[PDB]
């Protein structure tokens, strides 16, 4: 497959954690430094109902769903599935929020890269009906049987958009906060029964978190979720909004974010009415950075950018004029530098500090949308 391996020194493991089993419990995919590097065998889109969900999102049918499943049902992503957690160290932790029509597995290039640099990543699956699909269990016996209840994307009427997107960003923030609590709780001995029966022993996570080093990151709906989560939850020490979609946020949020905030935008997606919300977060007393990736489209941040060929990708807008690997290294490296600065890490990420300032042939400092 063409999802890139991570560039950092650690090998990368992957597993899923759902707790509690209910529609109100937490559901996340974890990426983490693994002890060993035995095979890059993780299944990318691990269930057929995601393809039905994804098709429902693209406004098509049962047939497109079956086509996607054929194209992608067996694609892997470069992480050792259920591999042991690399011991002897406390890792900084990232909570990741997916965009509208996505789900927890679709930003593995980001997650796997961060994990190869020593982060644990918890990519959350939202149950706000913004995911194409997701699932949960109606009772503990259903979880033992693997008897999943599915939840599919809600389509909205224009008259619903403002209220519902807002309610969803609030729930989303609460899901980020709650997923954080879950990991923090396991970090500190909380016994936990994974609703999914997986080989990875969640006890490995006991005493594995550097609890002061917590960031929230997210793409597009997930960008808005970064900002909301930051405003509510001070355990998150900084934010990185990947081509945020600002529309869901209420006016109240803007004055309420003390933590450092990084906007990494695609050249081809942004518009003034959206950029203007981003500019409202700026204040001499706060740290905000913004860079724009030259030749990039919105989809450059998610994994479908790696799923097809140049020509098809370009025509479907999964790819822009920049190389997908070039784009995702620029985003990841900038991110790593930002994390090192605002989490106080003692690594070598500050070598890409100039990428925070847009100092690359493939970056614009700030935004091409010059609206002030
Ligand atoms: P975001 O949540 O981006 C997805 C396409 C990944 O919102 C857009 C669709 C407006």
UniProtKB/Swiss-Prot annotation:
One of its GO terms (molecular function) is 1-alkyl-2-acetylglycerophosphocholine esterase activity. The keyword Transmembrane helix does not apply. Its EC number is 3.1.1.47. Changing residue 55 to A: Activity is higher than wild-type. The active site is at 220 (nucleophile), 243 (charge relay system), 298 (charge relay system). Plasma. Secreted by macrophages (at protein level). N-glycosylated. Macrophage-derived PLA2G7 carries sialylated complex-type N-glycans that hinder its binding to HDL particles. It catalyses: a 1-O-alkyl-2-acetyl-sn-glycero-3-phosphocholine + H2O = a 1-O-alkyl-sn-glycero-3-phosphocholine + acetate + H(+); 1-O-decyl-2-acetyl-sn-glycero-3-phosphocholine + H2O = 1-O-decyl-sn-glycero-3-phosphocholine + acetate + H(+); 1-O-dodecyl-2-acetyl-sn-glycero-3-phosphocholine + H2O = 1-O-dodecyl-sn-glycero-3-phosphocholine + acetate + H(+); 1-O-tetradecyl-2-acetyl-sn-glycero-3-phosphocholine + H2O = 1-O-tetradecyl-sn-glycero-3-phosphocholine + acetate + H(+). One of its GO terms (biological process) is phosphatidylcholine catabolic process. Changing residue 233 to A: Almost no activity. GO terms for cellular component: extracellular region; high-density lipoprotein particle; low-density lipoprotein particle. It is an enzyme of class 3 (hydrolase). Its main location: secreted. Changing residue 315 to K: Impairs the association with HDL particles. Changing residue 298 to A: Loss of activity. Changing residue 64 to A: Reduces the association with LDL particles. Belongs to the AB hydrolase superfamily. Lipase family. This is Platelet-activating factor acetylhydrolase. The chain holds residues 54 to 425 of 441 of the full protein.
């Amino acid at each position: 497959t063409k999802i890139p391996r991570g560039n950092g020194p650690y090998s990368v493991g992957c597993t899923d954690l759902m707790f509690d089993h209910t529609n109100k419990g937490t559901f996340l995919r974890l990426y983490y430094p693994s002890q060993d590097n035995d095979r890059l065998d993780t299944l990318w889109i691990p269930n057929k109902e995601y393809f039905w969900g994804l098709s429902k999102f693209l406004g098509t049918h049962w047939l497109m769903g079956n086509i996607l499943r054929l194209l992608f049902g067996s694609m892997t992503t470069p992480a050792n599935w259920n591999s042991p957690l690399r011991p002897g160290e406390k890792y900084p932790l990232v909570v990741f929020s997916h965009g509208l029509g996505a789900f927890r597995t679709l930003y593995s290039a980001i997650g796997i890269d961060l994990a190869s640099h020593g982060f644990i990543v918890a990519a959350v699956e939202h149950r706000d009906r913004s995911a194409s699909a997701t699932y949960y269990f109606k009772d503990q016996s259903a979880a033992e049987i693997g008897d999943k209840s599915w939840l599919y994307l809600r389509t909205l009427k224009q008259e619903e958009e403002t209220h519902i997107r807002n309610e969803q960003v609030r729930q989303r923030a609460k899901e980020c906060s709650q997923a954080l609590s879950l990991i923090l709780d396991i970090d500190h001995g909380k016994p936990v029964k994974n609703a999914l029966d997986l080989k990875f022993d969640m006890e490995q996570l006991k005493d594995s978190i550097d609890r002061e080093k917590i960031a929230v990151i997210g793409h597009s709906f997930g960008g808005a979720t970064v900002i909301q989560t930051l405003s509510e939850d001070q355990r998150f020490r900084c934010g990185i909004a990947l081509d945020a979609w600002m529309f869901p946020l209420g006016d109240e949020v803007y004055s309420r974010i003390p933590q450092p905030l990084f906007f990494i935008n695609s050249e081809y997606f942004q518009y003034p009415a959206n950029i203007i919300k981003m500019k409202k977060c700026y204040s001499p007393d706060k740290e905000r950075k913004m860079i724009t990736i030259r030749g990039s489209v919105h989809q450059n941040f998610a994994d479908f950018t790696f799923a097809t060929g140049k020509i098809i990708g370009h025509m479907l807008k999964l790819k822009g004029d920049i190389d997908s690997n070039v784009a995702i290294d620029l985003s990841n490296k900038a991110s790593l530098a930002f994390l090192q600065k605002h989490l106080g890490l003692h690594k070598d990420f500050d070598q890409w500090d100039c990428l925070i300032e847009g100092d690359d042939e493939n970056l614009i400092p700030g935004t091409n949308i010059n609206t002030t």
